[PDB]
């Protein structure tokens, strides 16, 4: 049930019933954490960090091995992102569309797509304010958005 | 319609259905051990990899990400794990 698409997709991940780590896994809980730290110091998003561990080091689920989620591990060490990842990616998309739209006056479709992206930004911003992730004065402005990200 | 018992599906029935439509969800991906040529060190690679996998020892390109299952390089040897 996509918000802006009539079609209903079903492609998603399905976690196995088992929550135990495999026997072949030769990495310990401590060893995985420093790999997370090194990847973060390289400048990678937590979603991208999990992909790298899955592809090469055979880390199917970081939560099952270390007992903590990736973002919670990063916060403990102090490598906390300034802005939430999904919010930051959405703001990044809006700037790129707006930058293109200034050089193309007649692009009606880019104007229409810009409205939908801003609608998701406003909805997510209100939710994060409720969870107190953002201070209750943060606002999204088109001029400010470039400086934000 | 043909009669199917929801409690005890046959092994060929539950292997054919969608991974989300089974009685209990179970992914169709897996982990494998690959041995590159040039040096016989063993590397664990996810089947549906999305990033190029390089050997730790010799830095040879093992697999290339694709739409579905990752394609291995020629001459490699692979073993399903578990």
């Amino acid at each position: 049930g996509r918000m802006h698409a009539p079609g209903k997709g079903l492609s998603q991940s399905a976690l196995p019933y088992r929550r135990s780590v495999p026997t072949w896994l030769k990495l310990t809980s401590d060893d995985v954490k420093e790999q997370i730290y090194k990847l973060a110091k390289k400048g990678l998003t937590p979603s991208q960090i999990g992909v790298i561990l899955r592809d090469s080091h055979g880390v199917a689920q970081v939560r099952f091995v270390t007992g903590n989620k990736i973002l919670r591990i990063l916060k403990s060490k102090g490598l906390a992102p300034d802005l939430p990842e999904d919010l930051y990616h959405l703001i990044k998309k809006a700037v790129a569309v707006r930058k293109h739209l200034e050089r193309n006056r007649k692009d009606k479709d880019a104007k229409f797509r810009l409205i939908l992206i801003e609608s998701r930004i406003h909805r997510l911003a209100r939710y994060y304010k409720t969870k107190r992730v953002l201070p209750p004065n943060w606002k999204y402005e088109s001029s400010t958005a470039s400086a934000l990200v | 319609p043909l009669a199917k018992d929801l409690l005890h599906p046959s092994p060929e029935e539950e292997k054919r259905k969608h991974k989300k439509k089974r009685l209990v969800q179970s992914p169709n991906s897996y982990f494998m051990d690959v041995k590159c040529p040039g040096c016989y060190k063993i590397t664990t690679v996810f089947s549906h990899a999305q990033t190029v996998v390089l050997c730790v020892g010799c830095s040879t390109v093992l697999c290339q990400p694709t739409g579905g299952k990752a394609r291995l390089t020629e001459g490699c040897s692979f073993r399903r794990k578990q």
């Binding site: 400048g43 998003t45 490598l79 906390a80 992102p81 300034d82 990200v149 | -």
Partner: peptide, 27 residues
């Protein structure tokens, strides 16, 4: 394949995402 990955390094390797990336940049 290695060349194609190296061109993609610019997009996936961020320079201003984390908090510490800002504070040592100001130095």
């Amino acid at each position: 394949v290695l060349e194609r990955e190296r061109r993609k390094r610019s997009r996936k390797e961020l320079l201003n995402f984390y908090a510490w990336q800002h504070r040592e940049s100001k130095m």
